[PDB]
């Protein structure tokens, strides 16, 4: 499948794409305001994620640090990034279907739209000012709004027993972004697309 990743924010982001144990395509790239990056993802890929990182520094050899979404200090992510990160998630060609969502389960850093560019399904978006409204206990000094599991580390917030309910914190996310996952057992906001669809991920889709 093809993903076009577009930075419509007024600030630079460093995009990242990973399946958790490997980079997708080149794994990461600087995107200045307006720039697009097209990547190819092997069919069959399960558990892929795309996210933005903010405020990064990298030396000449691809090594450094980002304030949000850092994936072990590398420009080219092989692993998933550190919260807070708004997540575009996908699994491709799973018995003829593609499944996509946006998740706030690892917090929020940048607004996002995740849309198919092919026929047969709808996109999803989380474009509210989560960071501005973020409860003080979840506000990340780095910028962003952490999830409550990351901050508090309880069985309820992390859904460790696989039995957990919604919380004041999950509800905060859900109220601003109803089409994104707010906790692990959220009623799914997953979209099913025809297998082998192509997609566009837009950061800051309104701004």
From Swiss-Prot:
Keyword terms: Cytoplasmic vesicle, Disulfide bond, Signal, Taste-modifying protein
Pfam family, one: Thaumatin
Gene Ontology cellular component list: cytoplasmic vesicle
Compartments it resides in: Cytoplasmic vesicle
Xref: SUPFAM superfamilies: Osmotin, thaumatin-like protein
Disulfide bridges in this chain: 9-204, 56-66, 71-77, 121-193, 126-177, 134-145, 149-158, 159-164
Keyword Disulfide bond: yes
Domain of life of the native organism: Eukaryota
Function text: Taste-modifying protein; intensely sweet-tasting. It is 100000 times sweeter than sucrose on a molar basis.
UniProt family annotation: Belongs to the thaumatin family.
Protein name: Thaumatin I
Source organism per UniProt: Thaumatococcus daniellii
């Amino acid at each position: 499948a093809t993903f076009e990743i577009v930075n419509r924010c007024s600030y630079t982001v460093w995009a990242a794409a990973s399946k958790g144990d490997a980079a997708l395509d080149a794994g990461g790239r600087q995107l200045n305001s307006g720039e697009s990056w097209t990547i190819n993802v092997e069919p069959g890929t399960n558990g892929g994620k795309i996210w933005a990182r903010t405020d990064c520094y990298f030396d000449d050899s691809g090594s450094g640090i980002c304030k949000t979404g850092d994936c072990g200090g590398l420009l080219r992510c092989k692993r998933f990034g550190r919260p807070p990160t708004t997540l575009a998630e996908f699994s491709l060609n799973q018995y003829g279907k593609d499944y996509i969502d946006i998740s706030n389960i690892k917090g929020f850093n940048v607004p996002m739209n995740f849309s198919p560019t092919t026929r047969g399904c709808r996109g999803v978006r989380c474009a509210a000012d989560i960071v501005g409204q973020c409860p003080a206990k979840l506000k990340a000094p780095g910028g962003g709004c952490n999830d409550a599991c990351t901050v508090f580390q309880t069985s309820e917030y992390c859904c460790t027993t696989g039995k957990c309910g919604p919380t004041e914190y999950s509800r905060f996310f859900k109220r601003l972004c109803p089409d994104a996952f707010s906790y692990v057992l959220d009623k799914p906001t997953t979209v099913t697309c025809p297998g082998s669809s192509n997609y566009r991920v837009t950061f800051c889709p309104t701004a």
